[PDB]
Structure 1
C-alpha cells in the first residue's frame, strides 16, 4: 500500500556513513589542509571519518612519522571531534583512527 509513504516519512529520520580520508606519511601542508577541510565537512554534516595512514615499502620503518600526522589531525579537529579509536600497532601497513561528530 501507499503504506510505503509511511516509510518515506520514516526515512526522513536520518543516517550516518563513515567517510574515509587516506593520509600518507609525508603529505604536504596544502593537501593536508584540503583533506582536513574534507573532514571538517564530513563531520559537521553528521558523519564519521575512518582516517587511514598507509605506509608503503620501507616507510613502515619510520611508523613514528605517521603517528605524528594522525596526532596533528586529532589536535586540529579538536573542538569538532571525539576520537572513537586511535591505533598503536601498524597492522598491515595501516593506522586507522576513527573520528566521530562531537
Structure 2
C-alpha cells in the first residue's frame, strides 16, 4: 500500500521499470529522479526489499486512487447482502402476522437472509410447540421464495429460524 516515492528513496542504486513495462535496468537514484521529472511522473519504490531496489516510473496519486476504488468496489460485490431478523411471539395473531409475512417476503425479494426469531417469556411448557408450528407455517408460505437454512433452535429465552432466498 504505502511506498516511499521520489526523495524518500535513500537507496543509492535502483532497478528502474518504465511507464508501460519497459525495463530500464540498474540505474542511479539521481538519474531515475531526472527521468521521472522528464515524464512528469513519480519515481515509486514498489520493490524496497529487492536487490537494486525495483523502482517504477508511474503517476503515484492516480495509482493510489485506483487502489482505493478497487478496495471500495470489492466491499459491495463483500459486506454483498446481510441478515434481517424478525422477532415473532407466542399467541401471535392475524393481521400482524400477515404484515410480518409480507415484510419477510420483501426482505427475500431484496436479497437479505432472514433470521426468523421468537423472544420468549416464561411458561416454557407450551412454548416449543406453537412457536415451532408458526415458523413452519411461515416457511411453507415462502417455499415459493426461500430455502430453509437453520431449522428450529433454542437460544435460552429465544427460538430462532433462518431462511435464505431461492435464486441468488
Partner of 2:120: 55
The 1-side partners of 2:150 and 2:75 are apart by: 29
Q: Which has the larger radius of gyration?
A: 2
The 2-side partners of 1:12 and 1:75 are apart by: 31
3-state SS of paired residue (2:149)? strand
3-state SS of paired residue (2:81)? coil
Deviation at 1:12, TM superposition (A): 4.9
Q: Say how many residue pairs are matched.
A: 100
User: Which structure dedicates a bigger proportion of its chain to strand?
Assistant: 2
Deviation at 1:85, TM superposition (A): 1.1
- Structure 2: where are the runs of 5+ without partners? 1-63
3-state SS of paired residue (2:152)? coil
Partner of 2:74: 10
Give me the CA root mean square deviation: 1.7
Change (3 A) 1:2 1:84: same
1:84 aligns with 2:84: no
The 2-side partners of 1:55 and 1:11 are apart by: 36
Normalised by the size of structure 2, how large is the TM-score?
Answer: 0.55
The 2-side partners of 1:86 and 1:9 are apart by: 34
Deviation at 1:74, TM superposition (A): 0.7
Change (3 A) 1:6 1:50: same
User: Which structure dedicates a bigger proportion of its chain to helix?
Assistant: 1
Partner of 1:96: 160
Deviation at 1:101, TM superposition (A): 0.6
The 2-side partners of 1:64 and 1:30 are apart by: 21
Following superposition, which runs of at least 4 residues in structure 1 exceed 6 angstroms of deviation?
A: none
Matches within 5 A, 1:19-30: 19-30=84-95
Deviation at 1:65, TM superposition (A): 1.3
The 1-side partners of 2:155 and 2:76 are apart by: 39
